[PDB]
Every structure is written in C-alpha cells, then in structure tokens.
Amino acid sequence: MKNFSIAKSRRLRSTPYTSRIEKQGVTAYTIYNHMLLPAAFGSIEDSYKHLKEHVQIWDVAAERQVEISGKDSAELVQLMTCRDLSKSKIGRCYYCPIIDENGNLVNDPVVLKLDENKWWISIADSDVIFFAKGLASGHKFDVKIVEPVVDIMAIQGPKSFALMEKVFGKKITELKFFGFDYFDFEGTKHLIARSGWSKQGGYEVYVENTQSGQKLYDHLFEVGKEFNVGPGCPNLIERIESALLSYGNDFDNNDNPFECGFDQYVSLDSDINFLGKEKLKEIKLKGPQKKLRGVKIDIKEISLTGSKNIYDENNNVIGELRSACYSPHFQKVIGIAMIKKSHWEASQGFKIQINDNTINGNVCDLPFI
Amino acid sequence: MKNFSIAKSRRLRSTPYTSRIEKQGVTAYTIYNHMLLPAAFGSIEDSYKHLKEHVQIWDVAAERQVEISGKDSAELVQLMTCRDLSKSKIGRCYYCPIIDENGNLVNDPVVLKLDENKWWISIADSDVIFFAKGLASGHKFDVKIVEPVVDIMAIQGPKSFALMEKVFGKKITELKFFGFDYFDFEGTKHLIARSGWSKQGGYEVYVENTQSGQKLYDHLFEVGKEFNVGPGCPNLIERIESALLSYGNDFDNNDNPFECGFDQYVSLDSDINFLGKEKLKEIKLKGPQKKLRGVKIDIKEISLTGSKNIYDENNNVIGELRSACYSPHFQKVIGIAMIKKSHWEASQGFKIQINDNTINGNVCDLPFI
Numbered sequence: 001m002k003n004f005s006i007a008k009s010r011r012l013r014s015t016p017y018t019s020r021i022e023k024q025g026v027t028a029y030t031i032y033n034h035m036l037l038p039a040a041f042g043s044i045e046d047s048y049k050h051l052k053e054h055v056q057i058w059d060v061a062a063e064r065q066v067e068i069s070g071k072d073s074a075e076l077v078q079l080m081t082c083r084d085l086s087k088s089k090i091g092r093c094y095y096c097p098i099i100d101e102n103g104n105l106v107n108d109p110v111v112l113k114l115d116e117n118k119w120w121i122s123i124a125d126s127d128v129i130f131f132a133k134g135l136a137s138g139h140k141f142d143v144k145i146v147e148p149v150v151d152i153m154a155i156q157g158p159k160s161f162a163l164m165e166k167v168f169g170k171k172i173t174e175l176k177f178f179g180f181d182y183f184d185f186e187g188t189k190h191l192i193a194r195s196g197w198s199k200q201g202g203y204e205v206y207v208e209n210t211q212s213g214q215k216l217y218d219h220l221f222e223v224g225k226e227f228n229v230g231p232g233c234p235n236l237i238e239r240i241e242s243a244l245l246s247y248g249n250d251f252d253n254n255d256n257p258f259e260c261g262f263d264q265y266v267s268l269d270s271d272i273n274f275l276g277k278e279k280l281k282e283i284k285l286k287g288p289q290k291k292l293r294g295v296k297i298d299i300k301e302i303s304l305t306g307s308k309n310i311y312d313e314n315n316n317v318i319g320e321l322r323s324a325c326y327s328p329h330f331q332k333v334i335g336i337a338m339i340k341k342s343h344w345e346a347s348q349g350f351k352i353q354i355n356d357n358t359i360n361g362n363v364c365d366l367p368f369i
Numbered sequence: 370m371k372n373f374s375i376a377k378s379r380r381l382r383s384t385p386y387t388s389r390i391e392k393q394g395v396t397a398y399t400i401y402n403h404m405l406l407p408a409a410f411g412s413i414e415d416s417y418k419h420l421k422e423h424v425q426i427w428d429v430a431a432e433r434q435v436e437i438s439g440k441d442s443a444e445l446v447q448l449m450t451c452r453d454l455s456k457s458k459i460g461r462c463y464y465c466p467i468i469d470e471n472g473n474l475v476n477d478p479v480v481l482k483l484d485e486n487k488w489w490i491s492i493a494d495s496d497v498i499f500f501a502k503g504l505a506s507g508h509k510f511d512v513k514i515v516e517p518v519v520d521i522m523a524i525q526g527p528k529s530f531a532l533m534e535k536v537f538g539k540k541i542t543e544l545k546f547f548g549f550d551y552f553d554f555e556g557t558k559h560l561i562a563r564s565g566w567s568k569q570g571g572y573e574v575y576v577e578n579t580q581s582g583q584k585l586y587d588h589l590f591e592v593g594k595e596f597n598v599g600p601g602c603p604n605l606i607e608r609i610e611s612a613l614l615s616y617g618n619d620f621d622n623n624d625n626p627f628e629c630g631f632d633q634y635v636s637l638d639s640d641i642n643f644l645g646k647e648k649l650k651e652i653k654l655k656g657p658q659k660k661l662r663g664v665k666i667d668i669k670e671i672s673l674t675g676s677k678n679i680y681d682e683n684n685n686v687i688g689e690l691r692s693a694c695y696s697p698h699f700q701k702v703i704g705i706a707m708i709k710k711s712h713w714e715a716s717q718g719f720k721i722q723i724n725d726n727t728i729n730g731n732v733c734d735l736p737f738i
C-alpha cells in the first residue's frame with residue numbers, strides 16, 4: 001500500500017474535538033504525546049493559503065499540559081530549563097527549552113505562570129511529566145505534578161483577531177502576544193493565551209470545562225462564516241517557512257540548545273541553577289560543531305520520513321536534512337538541516353539523493369521569510 | 370471518515386525493518402515510543418489464525434530500551450520498580466512495574482540483567498528514560514542512562530521453537546522462558562531472549578548490529594517456509610484472549626498495581642527502596658476500589674477507540690471498557706474493563722449502548738483462556 005491507516009485505540013488518545021473534525025474533513029493524523037493530532041485536511045498547500053488569508057480552528061489537544069503546583073513549583077520549573085524565569089510574571093508565557101544532565105534537549109515547551117506556586121508547561125512530543133516526577137522525587141521537592149484536563153483549541157490566521165473580538169469583545173483585543181487571561185463564554189471562564197504554532201496570529205484556548213469548550217468550538221464555526229473560517233492544523237509549509245522547530249523532527253535528545261538556534265534562551269551568566277548548566281558553559285565557549293540551517297533544493301516535490309544525509313563535492317556527509325516541503329513562495333523545496341560547521345555559510349552548496357538522482361541545494365538562514 | 374492515513378515524519382521514527390515490512394503487506398500502523406509499530410498486515414482475524422498455528426516475524430523495534438549502567442545502576446533500576454530485584458540473576462528477564470510518587474503505574478517493562486552494573490529496561494509506551502534521568506539527577510547517582518541502538522525483532526507462534534532451532538541449533542532449545550543468552554548468526558553474536566508479546570511462544574532478538582539483524586530477518590523468511598512463516602505484529606485478538614495488558618489501554622498513570630492484578634510483582638515486605646512504597650502499603654490495606662476484569666459482550670463486531678462506560682440495569686456507570694475485540698474463540702466480543710468494587714464479581718451482568726442497540730454483557734475472570 002502507498003499510505004497506511006492509523007490504528008486507533010484507547011492508548012492513541014482521542015480528543016474532545018475528534019468527532020467534530022472527523023465530520024469536517026480530516027484526512028491524516030499524526031500522534032503527538034500519545035494523542036491524535038490532525039496532520040491534514042486534504043491539500044497541505046490549500047490549507048497553507050487559507051491559514052495565511054483567513055482563520056482556522058485547530059484541535060491541538062495533543063499539546064498536553066504538565067501542571068506543577070506547590071511550594072517548590074517555581075524552583076522545579078526553573079531547574080528543568082536554561083531560560084531565566086527569575087523575573088517572570090503571572091499572565092505571561094515563556095518559551096523555555098528543557099534540558100537534561102548532558103545539556104541536551106528534552107522538550108521545548110511554553111511555560112505559563114498562573115501563580116507563583118502554579119505553573120503550566122505546554123509541551124512538545126515527549127513525556128515531560130515523568131522528567132518532572134523523577135526530578136521532584138530525587139530532589140525531594142514539595143510539589144504536586146499532574147497532567148490536568150486541558151485540551152487546547154487554537155484560532156489562527158489573520159482573521160483570528162476579528163473572530164475572537166466578535167465572540168469575546170474588546171477586552172481580548174488588548175491581550176499582548178504571549179500573554180494570557182480569563183474570558184467568559186456563556187458564563188464559563190476560559191484561559192486564553194495569545195499564542196499558537198504559527199506566525200499567522202491568533203490564540204489558544206486552554207479548555208478545562210470540556211463541554212463549554214466543545215460548544216465554543218461549534219460557535220466559532222457558526223459565527224466565523226463571514227471570515228471564511230475552516231478547520232485546520234499545524235501546517236508543514238508555514239511552520240518550515242517560519243522556522244518553528246519541532247522536537248523529534250528538527251532536534252532531539254542528542255542535540256543541545258546551541259546547535260538549535262536557542263542561544264538567546266540559555267541564561268549562563270545569571271545566578272539560577274538548571275540542569276547541564278555545567279556542560280552548556282563548556283559548549284558555549286568552544287561553540288557548536290553543527291547547527292540547524294535552512295536549505296533550498298531545486299526540485300518541486302519531496303516526502304520526508306526521516307533524516308537524509310547531505311553531501312559535499314567530495315561526497316563526504318556534511319549534514320542531515322530533517323524536515324522539508326515544497327514551498328509555493330520559492331517554487332522549490334525548502335527544509336531544515338543539521339549541518340556541520342564546514343558548511344554553515346548561507347549560499348554554501350551541497351548535494352543530496354532523492355529517489356536515485358543527485359540534486360543540488362544550497363544552505364540559507366532561518367527563517368525563510 | 371472511516372479509516373485515516375498516518376502522516377509520516379522524522380519524529381514518527383522508522384525502524385530497520387520498515388523497508389522490508391512495506392514490501393510484505395503492512396496496511397496499518399500504530400505509534401509506540403515515538404516509533405512506527407505495525408498494527409495490521411491486512412485482516413486481523415487472518416493474522417490471528419496464522420499466529421496461533423504457524424510462526425511470524427515481527428518488527429517490534431518500538432519496544433525501546435533504557436540502558437542504565439555504572440556503579441549506581443542496580444540501585445536506580447530498583448528505585449523505579451516495586452519488583453524485588455535483590456536476587457536477580459544475569460541472563461534472566463523480569464517483569465517490573467514502574468511506580469511513581471503516588472504509587473501509580475508509569476510503565477510495565479521487562480528488565481534484563483546484563484551485568485550487576487548494566488541493565489536494559491524494555492519499555493511499554495512511555496518515556497521511562499526521562500523518569501530515570503530525573504531520578505538520577507536528584508540522587509546524584511553515578512550512572513549512564515542512554516537509549517541504546519537496539520531494535521527488537523520477534524519470532525512468535527508455536528513453530529517459533531522449530532524455526533529458531535533450524536537457524537541456531539540445539540543450544541537455543543535449552544533457553545528457558547524469560548531467559549536470554551548470546552547466539553551467533555553468520556559470525557555476529559546477538560542477544561536473544563525467550564519472551565515476546567504473545568502467549569503463543571517464541572523469542573525476541575535484541576538486535577544491536579543492525580545490518581546483521583536485517584540479514585537474520587531475511588534468512589528467517591528464506592528458511593522458514595517449512596513452517597509457513599509470515600510477517601506479523603502484536604495481535605489485538607490474541608493479546609486480549611491471552612489477557613496481556615497494555616499500558617495506556619487497560620491501565621494508565623491514574624492506576625496502581627493492585628487495580629491491575631500486579632499484586633504478585635509488588636514487594637512490600639522486603640528491604641528494597643522504591644517510589645510509592647508507603648502509599649502502596651496504604652493502598653494494599655484498604656484494598657482497591659476498582660480493578661481490571663474481563664468482559665464478554667453479545668454482539669459480533671466492535672471498533673473500540675477509547676473508554677466506553679458500562680452500566681447497570683438502572684443506568685449507573687459501574688466501569689469502563691478499555692480494550693475490546695471480536696473473538697473468534699468465543700464467537701462474540703470480549704474485552705478488558707476497569708470495574709467498580711460493587712460490580713467485580715464474576716458473572717455480574719451489565720449493559721452497554723452500541724449505536725442503536727443496548728447490548729448485554731457480563732464480567733469475568735482474567736485470563737480468558
């Protein structure tokens with residue numbers, strides 16, 4: 001067979017939105033945090049164009065939360081990330097790389113400060129809950145760690161502001177990027193952040209009152225018709241163009257933050273302790289020997305399923321292509337690659353095999369646009 | 370909306386056997402430990418009938434290892450599990466429930482003792498490596514924790530013993546259940562255990578030398594025609610009939626071992642140190658308020674995708690059906706349910722609504738066969 005079906009089970013968790021999206025045209029799934037995440041609603045290029053011009057509602061429930069509360073909750077959160085949260089404020093979100101004892105990436109979540117003693121870690125695809133539970137036990141921290149009942153719905157695209165203002169009124173229009181607050185829908189208060197896995201604008205509704213969230217979802221589709229609302233999901237083209245990096249795709253637990261472009265989030269000259277701080281000072285002094293870069297490849301199609309080596313003029317491996325797609329903006333394939341220090345330079349040429357032909361590409365900066 | 374395609378990416382990791390199985394009729398995938406695991410090679414019932422009579426070769430690479438080595442490795446491994454490993458022997462495998470600070474299940478792995486200071490933990494679908502790393506950091510254990518390059522191939526079914534003797538000779542016939550040793554194929558030594566996720570007999574080859582394992586895979590197909598060898602995968606029908614429990618399906622991180630039938634693996638009265646030991650003591654003394662049981666249901670078809678409530682005659686919820694399938698042995702649907710203390714007793718009747726019909730079922734003992 002060309003394509004393979006996904007086998008559903010209790011373990012591959014459905015979401016509060018599954019029944020809805022399966023009547024709205026979902027065509028493909030991925031699995032993310034042991035949960036179904038839509039991957040396509042037909043053509044990825046059509047979804048891309050729609051996202052960039054209108055507004056979409058996304059089931060991103062698979063963006064699970066790790067809730068850490070109690071007296072040592074701030075310290076535990078800080079312990080897991082190289083980002084300095086000492087001046088963090090309630091009602092703000094923070095991109096916080098989580099690192100291990102080697103200094104290598106575990107996850108790249110967004111952390112929400114709900115209170116000094118209550119934190120939500122909105123996670124990429126790894127079981128951060130168990131890292132946090134292991135740490136808390138070993139460090140004898142006084143915390144409560146749970147995966148709360150939170151199922152995010154995202155509202156993304158340029159018309160997201162107009163749609164959300166229609167439903168929630170003027171107060172939501174004051175919400176700054178990476179801020180959050182509480183908004184009423186038909187008597188139920190929902191936490192809403194101005195965030196989401198696109199650079200096309202919008203919000204994430206951290207649904208705790210599930211039935212109210214389901215009714216909100218339906219209401220967004222009803223009153224969003226004038227904005228050409230449609231279903232959607234994180235988009236492969238948009239996210240590669242925007243250089244939104246994906247744990248497990250672009251970087252993994254063999255990579256450190258300096259190989260990923262995360263330099264600005266590694267706080268080494270502060271007084272905070274976090275895992276691997278150690279080794280990260282050593283890495284920063286010598287500098288990385290490999291780093292994420294963009295590539296362009298002159299061909300019009302690709303289906304990347306795993307790393308592909310890229311090569312030099314003496315056919316020595318100089319990198320690994322990790323994410324890629326056809327970009328309508330460039331009218332060629334673009335992608336994200338881990339490249340050796342010899343080949344970092346934007347415009348640097350390389351070779352790659354697709355099917356059985358050697359094809360030229362070149363290195364470029366991130367983001368692409 | 371009936372079947373949906375899986376969307377491949379680097380993050381949904383391929384295996385050393387993917388290219389082979391995709392020429393041998395794989396039709397559906399699940400995701401297990403962030404890795405592709407075959408779910409079907411066409412009809413499940415046909416696969417079931419074949420497994421029960423003949424022999425299958427399975428890509429179960431998604432059964433990842435956590436390797437913990439070094440001076441404090443034995444202690445860290447024991448810290449994670451309620452199973453007493455104090456008399457454990459090199460060359461033996463042990464079923465070791467992994468427990469958190471609440472006494473709840475994190476994973477149900479099998480642990481292989483390679484050396485006093487080298488342990489492989491063969492894991493179910495959760496990121497045990499991060500639990501280990503968290504614990505090691507807080508205790509400052511002198512250990513190395515890695516996911517090694519190990520990609521299990523299983524050989525399962527009543528003809529597995531004969532096929533493996535054909536390749537490896539008399540000495541493999543001496544291997545006892547849940548034992549392992551090293552066996553030469555074409556000059557390369559492979560760790561082989563008598564284990565696997567069926568009750569139909571066989572082995573798991575813990576392939577480290579990937580190229581050799583690939584050659585072995587091909588060789589088993591060539592020399593296994595005598596035994597009607599075929600490809601296959603963990604089988605839903607067989608595993609439910611055999612009462613093999615799956616983390617995320619039948620039990621999860623809200624459940625403790627005394628709700629799951631794991632009592633024989635919980636060591637409370639020895640000197641071992643592990644998480645949740647106190648709470649397990651507290652829990653064992655009250656007794657569980659819910660437990661896994663078997664069910665039989667009077668219809669001939671089911672497609673279970675998540676928990677289904679099961680009801681008494683007056684519409685009170687008395688449990689949750691968590692895994693189910695049509696069983697050709699019973700000529701009806703069977704399954705595994707978490708049932709409340711009021712309604713455990715074997716033979717207790719219940720109701721379940723499947724679309725337009727309320728269907729009768731009853732509670733039963735595990736195992737079914």
Ligand SMILES: C[SH](C)CCC(=O)O
Nearest residue numbers: 060063197234246247
């Ligand atoms: C759920 S999004 C925030 C991430 C999707 C991806 O990594 O492919």
Ligand SMILES: C[SH](C)CCC(=O)O
Nearest residue numbers: 429432566603615616
């Ligand atoms: C990989 S098997 C050992 C388990 C598969 C399942 O839990 O469905």
Ligand code: NA
Nearest residue numbers: 037060061062
């Ligand atoms: Na989701």
Ligand code: NA
Nearest residue numbers: 406429430431
């Ligand atoms: Na696998």
